Amino acid sequence: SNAMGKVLVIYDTRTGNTKKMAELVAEGARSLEGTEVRLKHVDEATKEDVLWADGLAVGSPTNMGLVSWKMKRFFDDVLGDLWGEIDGKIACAFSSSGGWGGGNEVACMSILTMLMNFGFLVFGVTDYVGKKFTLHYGAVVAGEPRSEEEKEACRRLGRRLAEWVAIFVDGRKELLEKIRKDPARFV
Amino acid sequence: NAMGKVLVIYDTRTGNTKKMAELVAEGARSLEGTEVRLKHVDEATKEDVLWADGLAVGSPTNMGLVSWKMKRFFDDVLGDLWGEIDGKIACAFSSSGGWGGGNEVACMSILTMLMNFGFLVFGVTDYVGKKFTLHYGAVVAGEPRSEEEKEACRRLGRRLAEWVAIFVDGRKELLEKIRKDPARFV
Amino acid sequence: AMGKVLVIYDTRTGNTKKMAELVAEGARSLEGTEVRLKHVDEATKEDVLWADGLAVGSPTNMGLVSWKMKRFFDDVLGDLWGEIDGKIACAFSSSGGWGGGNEVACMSILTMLMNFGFLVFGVTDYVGKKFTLHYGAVVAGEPRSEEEKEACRRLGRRLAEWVAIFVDGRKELLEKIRKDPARFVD
Amino acid sequence: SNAMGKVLVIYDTRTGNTKKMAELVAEGARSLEGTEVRLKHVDEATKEDVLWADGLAVGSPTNMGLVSWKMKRFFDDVLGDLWGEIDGKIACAFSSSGGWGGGNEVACMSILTMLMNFGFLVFGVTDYVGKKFTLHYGAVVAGEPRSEEEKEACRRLGRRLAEWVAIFVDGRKELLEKIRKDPARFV
């Protein structure tokens, strides 16, 4: 009788790397039973997708340390009319850069700041998905997600997104403690 | 059975951020059934954070950033809870010496720190004066004296209480009421 | 006596343009400084190559540089990446409200500029009693007050000075600025 | 008239990781002819060191996404009295974190923020030091710098600082163009 959790994975990309991340995020979210997922490229996406979403993952290549101009334009110009009337959606960020130390966490930060501006509740993930591999401000990779931990970081983002949607909008209050006390979250 | 647990925790150099923190707490208390705990960092405990559904965290802007004492609180007393208190709701506020002085950047640093714990973090869209808002947290230069500054501080607490009510306490009817409320924009 | 300063800006409503004009004036106020003032639509990669120092201005759009400004950097100046390191740059921004993200927008401009290997800065000066520009000049709406207009001037003025000291080698200025009491109002 | 480069490398560390970075940052800085370099833990650094320096490299463990509380305490409480009168120093940041995607670029950003507040001219490095390895907001590593690229990112940070000190303070402007066109900068 409750609805499924509604998750939007929306991404820009230059080479496809962020698309490969986006697919893994989306798979991450679908893995939580009773979560529904829409996966869109920015040129495909509509203001109605966002209205539909309980939770959003927004991905961009790291372009000069920041969200891409096409993702920025979508928020500024397409979502601009919705601004002020869509507060309290849940959102996170992800990004692929040319290199480690190349600004993928900073690009994530700029996605998050854009999302916060719309009054969304934003988050990153504490989970260690590899011994030295995490996603505190969003899922980040240099190039394509190739390694097991890189693929898993992407999945974990969508997973946690779907879980926060499930806890806070669907009201599965019981999942909070399950997650907090789960030893698998730390490799 | 309307219910909610809010911690306003703050640090201060000259007391300006205490003044804000009192207004934040009173904004949170304005939502019926919301218990608020107001603490200086020196008296705050691990347990206050465990008790809270939602946190408002204040600091003076000290070189663009959270104060070292507030940083130390998070690094060293909350450090033991790191990894198991994910999902608390949190927001930020700051008093700086001046406009253009880094209060929004200090708010970013607070939010960075809270996100590190797995908290869901927000600012406020609401315009509280015609040219006065709080997108990344409540910010003032010096003491909150104008009615705008005071109301921005109150509003942060409100929205915090509201988000706890909607998302923790399960009060879904408030969401659309907030979204469509004309009074949110002066 | 020598300096090349480029002030480049985006504007939707005219507000940031008003700021840019004052930034430029501030830069010109320093003797021997040549200044170009360009909208992003008329700016070229040869402008950025000509410049010793840059002041880059955008409206605060969702707390960040506008998408038009971002396109310009990604698409036109992109080809210059890796070969223009060491240019000197700073930021400015007009937003809809105080607490609306103007320092964060500046941060995002500086982030972009640092990616080009630029040396990047803000200004310590108190141009008014509770008015400064630590991360760039910031205003809510149009710069109308005397503090606001001077905040913009001072950014332009400090860029010109950094270029005069660091490119043109006028080391004597450095200490003059460091000890100048006029820098802090009151 | 024979003035030269004064570079201070100031660091905090809790397990030694950032100290190992700091040592390599200092090695890198010393590689440029006529660069004098001080290397100092925060616990032993003074305000005289900061006054002495043309250039600074500031390093900290990534702690909750930010500079050390000890490093912060040193700027607020011992360097604060210099605020407003040391504008125009040249400075950069470096950090070691527990994991990739763990906030090291953000920690660096927080250091740069602090340094900018002092009126310093602040930078990162475009140079690629491995195929997918760079240092755009400062040198970053998860753990101890152990691989060749991780060690060379640390060195390169110190190198570029010394280079900026040489070009911008000590007048040696022939170097700008040599650095600007150097193919070695991109592995």
* DSSP labels, C28-59: HTSTTEEEEEEETTT--HHHHHH-SEEEEEEE
- C-alpha B33/C-alpha B170 separation (Å) is 13
In angstroms, what separates the C-alpha of A65 from chain C's closest C-alpha?
A: 6
For C175, other C-beta atoms within 10 Å of its C-beta total 12
Contact B103 C101 (CB under 8 A): no
B19, B49 in Cβ contact below 8 A?
A: no
Alpha helices in chain C (DSSP H): 15-28, 45-50, 67-71, 102-115, 146-166, 171-178
- Residues of D whose CB is below 8 A from A123: none
Contact B112 D77 (CB under 8 A): no
Phi-psi region of C67 (alpha: psi -120 to 50; beta: other; left: phi over 0): alpha
Question: What is the secondary structure of chain D as a DSSP string?
Answer: ----EEEEEEE--SSSHHHHHHHHHHHHHHTSTTEEEEEEEGGG--HHHHHH-SEEEEEEE-BTTB--HHHHHHHHHTSGGGTTS-TT-EEEEEEEESSBTSSHHHHHHHHHHHHHHTT-EE--EEEEEETTEEEBTBEEEESS--SHHHHHHHHHHHHHHHHHHHHHTS--THHHHHHHT-GGGB-
For D3, other C-beta atoms within 10 Å of its C-beta total 11
- C-alpha A149/C-alpha A37 separation (Å) is 23
Contact of C69 with chain B, judged by CB distance below 8 Å, is answered with no
- C-alpha A125/C-alpha A134 separation (Å) is 8
Provide the CB-side half-sphere exposure for A116 (13 A, CA).
33
Nearest C-alpha neighbor of A115 from the set A156, A70, A55: A55
For A8, other C-beta atoms within 10 Å of its C-beta total 25
Q: What is the dihedral of CA B150, B101, C101, B34, to 10 degrees?
A: -30
- C-alpha D154/C-alpha B175 separation (Å) is 49
Phi-psi region of B118 (alpha: psi -120 to 50; beta: other; left: phi over 0): left
Task: Return the axis-axis angle of helices C146-166 and C171-178, rounded to nearest 10°.
Answer: 150
B66, B36 in Cβ contact below 8 A?
A: no
Mutate which of A86, A116, A127 to disrupt the B interface (most B C-beta within 10 Å)? A116
- C-alpha B24/C-alpha B150 separation (Å) is 9
3-state secondary structure B45-84: CHHHHHHCCEEEEEEECECCECCHHHHHHHHHHCHHHCCC
- C-alpha A122/C-alpha A92 separation (Å) is 6
DSSP letter, residue A103 = S
The first and second tokens of residue D161, run together, are 């600082």
- C-alpha A23/C-alpha A25 separation (Å) is 6
Option in A134, A142, A143 nearest D99 (CB):
A134
D62, D31 in Cβ contact below 8 A?
A: no
- Residues of D whose CB is below 8 A from C111: 109, 137
- Residues of A whose CB is below 8 A from C74: 63-64, 68-69
Cα D163 to chain centroid distance, Å, stands at: 12
The first and second tokens of residue A91, run together, are 């959102």
- C-alpha A120/C-alpha B40 separation (Å) is 28
For C80, other C-beta atoms within 10 Å of its C-beta total 15
Contact of B143 with chain C, judged by CB distance below 8 Å, is answered with no
Q: What is the resolution of this structure in A?
A: 2.4
Contact of C118 with chain D, judged by CB distance below 8 Å, is answered with yes
3-class DSSP assignment, residue A16: coil
Cα C166 to chain centroid distance, Å, stands at: 17
The answer for C 156-175 residues in CB contact with D (under 8 A) is: 162, 165-167, 169, 171, 174
A156, A139 in Cβ contact below 8 A?
A: yes
- C-alpha A60/C-alpha C105 separation (Å) is 18
Q: What angle do CA D170, D171, D176 make, to 5 degrees?
A: 110
- C-alpha C94/C-alpha D92 separation (Å) is 28
- C-alpha C156/C-alpha C55 separation (Å) is 7
The first and second tokens of residue D70, run together, are 């000890």
Chain B neighbours, 3+ Cβ pairs < 8 A: A, C, D
In angstroms, what separates the C-alpha of D68 from chain B's closest C-alpha?
A: 8
In angstroms, what separates the C-alpha of B106 from chain D's closest C-alpha?
A: 9
Alpha helices in chain B (DSSP H): 16-29, 46-51, 68-72, 103-116, 147-167, 173-179
The residues after which chain A has a C–N gap greater than 2.5 Å are none
Contact of D101 with chain A, judged by CB distance below 8 Å, is answered with yes
B42, amino acid identity? D
The first and second tokens of residue B37, run together, are 């705990």
3-class DSSP assignment, residue A118: coil
Question: What is the secondary structure of A119-175 as a DSSP string?
Answer: T-EE--EEEEEETTEEESSSEEEESS--SHHHHHHHHHHHHHHHHHHHHHTS--TTH
Contact of A144 with chain D, judged by CB distance below 8 Å, is answered with no
A38, A53 in Cβ contact below 8 A?
A: yes
- C-alpha A49/C-alpha B165 separation (Å) is 26
Contact A106 D153 (CB under 8 A): no
The first and second tokens of residue A9, run together, are 């994975």
Nearest C-alpha neighbor of C107 from the set C92, C119, C118, C96: C92
How far apart, in Å, do the first and last CA atoms of chain B sit? Answer: 33
- C-alpha B18/C-alpha B9 separation (Å) is 9
Option in C62, C101, C104 nearest A75 (CB):
C62
Domains delineated in chain A:
1-187 (3.40.50.360)
For C13, other C-beta atoms within 10 Å of its C-beta total 12
- C-alpha C121/C-alpha B17 separation (Å) is 27
**Which residues neighbour C137 within 8 Å (Cβ) at sequence distance 6 or greater?**
B100, C19, C23, C92, C93, C123, C151, C152, C154, C155
D5, D32 in Cβ contact below 8 A?
A: yes
DSSP letter, residue C92 = E
- C-alpha A151/C-alpha A112 separation (Å) is 21
Mutate which of C11, C67, C107 to disrupt the A interface (most A C-beta within 10 Å)? C67
